[PDB]
């Protein structure tokens, strides 16, 4: 209350560390407690975020989840007290999802791991390049709760990554969501999750498919029209030469006419 | 001052008869025992018919 009893906090963080070592489940009482104290603002310190990092890097599922939900809660200020976020994300993606393919986590937990990885990556300009092929298995409309997965796909995109590994993603989505015969919600979800990719990685889809997607402006369904207008207004301010003359809306065209001579 | 509905609503977080007792939902239930009644003017003629006595022939398609 008055002043932070460092002699006490530093002592009762050591027991959390020495609980998380015991690999059965006993770090539950460290994670559940450190989350409470962070929420009450009593343990705002660099020493504590390491505990939840180690929990996220643990083998027990209910401890890993406590760590992941701590670092989630859009993320919290604890990211700004990490020691190496890039190596953290690399170790997570290597241990849990891809490395051994132990298949311990269910889909509801895999999605929460994906959310954390993508939201760290987009925020801190990280580079892993395995993410973008791991998503492709799950990017199918016949898959369980894909609107969460594709909303994290965009969150791992940058201005500073090779756009080919995102081109393959966009061409998977385009092949499987805005193809022939697909439904209105499916096509609208595809276009909406592509334009919010291109808002971070603009040169990740080329003009030839950009035009194929702005085809769907006057689509009579009111989902695909609202979606295509967003892509058009996105590339009207960024790369309006990829768009055709029909779409450059009275100022992009005037800016191009003066700057083309 | 602490015993005021204003202060109660402030410290906690509309219908006639909401107190420390008897929230919204409860007042409506307890009004059922009374106001299945028939409204009239001063000379005497129906303004608002009683509940479940509207007396209008609908379009039954």
């Amino acid at each position: 209350t008055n002043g932070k009893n460092q002699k006490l906090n530093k002592s009762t963080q050591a027991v959390c560390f020495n609980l998380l070592d015991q690999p059965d489940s006993q770090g539950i009482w460290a994670t559940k407690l450190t989350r409470e104290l962070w929420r009450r603002g009593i343990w705002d310190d660099s020493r504590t975020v390491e505990i939840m990092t180690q929990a996220a890097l643990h083998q027990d599922v209910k401890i890993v989840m406590s760590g992941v939900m701590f670092f989630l809660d859009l993320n919290f200020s604890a990211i700004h007290l990490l020691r190496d976020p890039q190596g953290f994300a690399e170790k997570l993606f290597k241990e849990h999802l891809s490395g051994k393919t132990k298949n311990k986590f269910d889909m509801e937990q895999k999605i929460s791991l994906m959310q954390l990885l993508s939201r760290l990556i987009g925020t801190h300009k990280l580079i892993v390049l395995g993410i973008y092929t791991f998503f492709l298995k799950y990017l199918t409309p016949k898959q369980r709760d894909v609107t969460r997965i594709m909303s994290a796909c965009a969150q791992a995109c940058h201005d500073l990554v090779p756009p080919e590994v995102i081109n393959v993603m966009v061409r998977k989505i385009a092949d499987e969501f805005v193809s022939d015969g697909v439904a209105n919600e499916v096509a609208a979800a595809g276009i909406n999750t592509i334009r919010e990719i291109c808002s971070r990685a603009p040169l990740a889809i080329d003009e030839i498919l950009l035009q194929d997607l702005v085809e769907y402006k006057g689509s009579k369904a009111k989902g695909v029209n609202m979606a295509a207008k967003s892509l058009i207004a996105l590339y009207r301010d960024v790369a309006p030469e990829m768009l055709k003359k029909k779409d450059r809306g009275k100022n992009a065209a005037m800016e191009v006419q003066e700057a083309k001579k | 001052t602490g015993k005021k509905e204003k202060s109660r609503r402030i410290r906690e977080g509309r219908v006639k008869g909401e107190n420390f007792y008897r929230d919204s939902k409860r007042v409506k239930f307890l009004n059922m025992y009374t106001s299945g009644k028939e409204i009239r003017n001063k000379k005497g003629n129906l303004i608002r018919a009683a509940s479940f006595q509207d007396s209008t022939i609908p379009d039954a398609r």
Binding site: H80, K125, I127, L129, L160, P162 | -
Partner: protein
């Protein structure tokens, strides 16, 4: 103002009091002001600048660029002067840490993250195409402005307040507020 001139004059005289440590003392400006909280993302970034960093740059390039910049007095590299380096993290980190900055051709800023990916992006010296003062987490911010030119100090100060005590310093000299 010319209250900068009296400061810089006997800084240049301190130039000739403890003369030489057999190098050249660069000039620096340290910014101190209050009223902002960087733990919230109040971020700033601006690169509208022009020095003498004992220029040590490493350009990656092609045949068209390596024999362009063999002149110039510059360290240069092939693409497979980089391809045959990924096997050793501390090796690819030592070159990371060697040079003050990095540049590369317009072709190789698609391939450089596959090779020098984790490094060279958090370090804040990622290359830039050819043919900074980031408010990351702290209130403290120092920038190297020049060498042993009073104009440059004000030139940078107006830009910093443009973006938003002031101190000027040399390698071992004192502080002048």
């Amino acid at each position: 103002s010319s209250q900068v001139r009296e400061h810089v004059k006997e800084l240049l005289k301190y130039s000739n009091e403890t003369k030489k440590r057999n190098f050249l003392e660069t000039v620096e400006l340290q910014v101190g002001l209050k009223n902002y909280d960087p733990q919230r993302d109040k971020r700033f970034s601006g690169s509208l600048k022009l020095p003498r960093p004992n220029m040590s740059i490493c350009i990656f390039g092609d045949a068209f660029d390596v024999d362009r910049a063999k002149s110039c007095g510059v360290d240069a590299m092939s693409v497979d002067d980089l391809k045959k380096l990924n096997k050793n993290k501390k090796l690819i980190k030592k070159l990371s840490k060697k040079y003050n900055a990095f540049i590369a051709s317009e072709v190789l800023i698609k391939q450089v993250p596959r090779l020098l990916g984790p490094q060279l992006s958090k370090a804040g010296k990622f290359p830039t195409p050819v043919s900074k003062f980031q408010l990351k987490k702290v209130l403290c911010l120092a920038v190297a402005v020049g060498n042993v030119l009073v104009n440059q100090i004000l030139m940078s100060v107006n830009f910093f307040v443009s973006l938003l005590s002031l101190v000027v310093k040399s390698s071992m000299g004192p502080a002048f507020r």
